[PDB]
Structures are given as C-alpha cells and as structure tokens.
C-alpha cells in the first residue's frame, strides 16, 4: 500500500476532449487514485490544464503533484520523476491518453513490475507483421505495447544517467530499458486497452463504456 | 494488358454486409474490373454468394471464374489457382474484406510483384512493437502487412508442391513464400487500406469513401 508512484502523461489536445462528459484525462487518474497501492499521482500536463485535475484533489485518496512537459515523450518522464516520494518502490507511466485501462491489468502490471523490476502492459499483434530491410525485402511472437509501463525508480533513474552521460539517442522502440540489461516483463493486458485519439477511436470507447 | 489473374478471397458474412448500399466485397472486385492488366478475376465463395458478381459480368471488362473455398486460407488459394488461365504472367490475392484498396498501389504491387516475382502491399507499423520470448521477456524496420499479395504463378506452384511433399506447417505468419528462398517485395501501400470487419471498420469505411 502507498508503494506506487504515478506519472500520468498528459502534455501532448486529444487528452482532454471528452468521453460521457470527462475528459479523457480524468478517467486512468481516477482509476489509478482508488488503488491503495498508489501513494501519489504526478500529472505532467501545461500549467494551463491543472485545474482538470486540481477541482478532485481533496475527493482523492492520493497525493497529487505537478510537473511541466518536456521536449519530447522520455523528458516529460525525466520531469515527471523529479518530483516523485523519495520511498516509492514503483513508478508508472501511464498515457492519459488510454482511458480505458482495467484496474486488474493495473494491478497486474504493478505485480510484475515488483517482481522483475520493470514490466509493461501488452497484448499479441493481431496483424501480420514482417521484418523488412533496407531493400524493401522481406527477412524471413511479436507483441504490441500499451501503457502502464512499470519501473522501479532506481532502474529507471540508472537508465537516465546512462543515455546522458554516453550521448545515447532515445526513441519510442529504442526506449531507456533498451539499453539497460536489466529484464522487462511483458504482462498480458486488453484489446480494450486502446489510445483514444481520432474520432473513430471515441466512438468505440463509448461501446466498451 | 492482360496477364493478371486476381484471386479474390470472399469464402470467410463479414464481407456481403453493405458499403453505401453496396456489398463490400464488390468494392475490389469493381477496381480489380476496371484495370487493363487484370485478365480475370477468380472468385473464391460458397456457391450461395455467386449471384452477387454473376450479375456484373457482362458489363465488367474481364473474365469471371469461380472456385471452392478451402478449410484454412492457403486452400482457398490453391482452389483459386485451379482456375487462373494458362497464359497468366502474374496472381494477384486479395481479402474480400478489404474494400478501399486504391487502383494506384494496386498498381505499384503488381509492377514490385512483376519485377520481383513475389509483392506484397504493407504499411509501417505504426503501434510499438517488441519480440517476445518464452519467459514473457522483451528481446532487446516492422512492416504490417495488407493484400494484394502478388506472386507469379510458377513459384506459387512451386510453393504449394514444397509445403505438400515435405509437410511443412503453414500458418497466416509462416505462408508459403516464408518457406521459399525467393525474394519478397513490401510495395509501400496506404494506411486506408483496412480490413473492414467490425461496426467500428465500417463507419470508418464511409469516411475514407
Ligand atoms: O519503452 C518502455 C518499455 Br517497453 C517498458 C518500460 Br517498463 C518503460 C519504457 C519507457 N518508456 C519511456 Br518514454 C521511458 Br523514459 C521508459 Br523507461
Ligand atoms: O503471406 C504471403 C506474403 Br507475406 C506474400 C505473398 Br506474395 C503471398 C503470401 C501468401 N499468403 C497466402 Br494465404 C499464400 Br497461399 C501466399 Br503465397
Ligand atoms: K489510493
Ligand atoms: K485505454
Ligand atoms: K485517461
Ligand atoms: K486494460
Ligand atoms: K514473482
Ligand atoms: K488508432
Ligand atoms: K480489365
Ligand atoms: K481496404
Ligand atoms: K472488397
Ligand atoms: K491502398
Ligand atoms: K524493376
Ligand atoms: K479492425
């Protein structure tokens, strides 16, 4: 209980439009702060939006803090880390932009993450999916990635340290844990689990609301 | 002109339910009409469905053959390919239930499938995706892939005799040309091209129309 600390992505606007009345924002936050094992909830979101989610934070069991967006995806991470309980045992990452996030799967995911020290919420590709080379070749199980994406705070800030001090270049499939040898766990989560972005995408969160 | 035969997939009804108050497997089977390179078209459907394409084939401008649909999809094929003419330089596969395939990457799929022998239409994958292993581990350029998938008659011949003589296990990742030592082409197609199956697929499907 009170072990896990919450980095809610909410900086990227598609994350705030709305779904039966909530911003999309709202509803992984609220998930996340009826969980005890959540101590706190970090948003990361433009000063301009704080109040989204500051009008809950005496109806909340969790602590709430604030951090700004950086240039890209890993510096709203690095920004987000920053302001973190010097005790928690567990950070989570979690795009505000996925709604629809079972607390089983949460509750998976933080299990997993305990264990081995970083898992990640996925679900098998359902399309065929093939290696191709630089000759538009073919090169004769895959999974797709959702978040949470689970770490331990010491791995994750090892990680930090080691992309800044040899110059590494960081992209969304080439990620911090890239790097590190350290195993990441692949919990199995839900087709429903889906980012809530183009309007084709909202109308079908309503169904599975 | 003249050296295709398209082997149309609509035996899997997902693909008879209407697209602007047209069944959605006419969509391909019209564009696959009206291309001057396409000879034929071999319709692969329960024997109950044929009165949708029989009424059209007067007024399209190529030959229509009907074959048998298999137990798995690679049957299907080889029931098709029964029927393609003798002549035909070139086999052009296509999912029924992809209705908005656009006539200019068929185009580009059957130019990569002429030169190359083997062409396949794909898209980047655009959701991030990792190899995982055994344990549930993640294993520290990814191609989705659509149809047409265009291969030239003789090696898909060839294909069908190699899996057969040998035994060998296909399935919709390991098809027949994974086992072949010939090259395959990824003809860069359109993100538009979606398989229509779902409620969600089809409003989807009036927007791009
Ligand atoms: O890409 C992953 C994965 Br597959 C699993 C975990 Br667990 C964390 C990340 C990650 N993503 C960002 Br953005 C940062 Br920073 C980190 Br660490
Ligand atoms: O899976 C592919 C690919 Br990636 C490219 C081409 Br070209 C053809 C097939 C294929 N699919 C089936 Br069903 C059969 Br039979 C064959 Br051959
Ligand atoms: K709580
Ligand atoms: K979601
Ligand atoms: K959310
Ligand atoms: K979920
Ligand atoms: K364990
Ligand atoms: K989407
Ligand atoms: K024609
Ligand atoms: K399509
Ligand atoms: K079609
Ligand atoms: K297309
Ligand atoms: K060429
Ligand atoms: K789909």
Redesign the interface.
């Known amino acids: 209980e009170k072990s896990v600390s919450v980095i809610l992505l909410a900086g990227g606007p598609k994350q705030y439009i709305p779904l039966l009345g909530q911003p999309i924002a709202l509803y992984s936050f609220f998930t996340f702060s009826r969980m005890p094992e959540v101590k706190e909830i970090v948003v990361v979101c433009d000063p301009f939006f704080r109040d989204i989610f500051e009008e809950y934070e005496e109806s909340i069991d969790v602590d709430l803090s604030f951090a700004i967006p950086g240039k890209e995806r890993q510096d709203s991470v690095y920004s987000g880390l920053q302001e973190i309980d010097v005790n928690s045992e567990l950070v989570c990452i979690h795009d505000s932009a996925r709604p629809l996030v079972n607390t089983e799967d949460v509750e998976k995911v933080l299990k997993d993450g305990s264990a081995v020290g970083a898992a ?1 919420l ?1 679900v098998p ?1 359902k ?6 080379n630089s000759d ?3 090169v ?6 959702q978040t949470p994406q689970v770490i331990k705070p010491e791995l994750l800030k090892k990680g930090f340290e080691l992309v800044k001090s040899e110059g590494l270049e960081v992209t ?2 080439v990620s911090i ?2 790097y590190l040898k350290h ?6 989560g839900s087709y429903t689990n889906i980012k809530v972005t183009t309007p ?1 995408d909202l ?2 969160a309503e ?1 599975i609301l």
Chains 1, 2 share one sequence.
């Open positions: 990640v996925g590709a399309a065929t999916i093939k290696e191709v538009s070749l073919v004769k199980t895959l999974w797709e990635m969304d499939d844990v890239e195993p990441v766990y692949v919990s199995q084709d109308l079908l169904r």
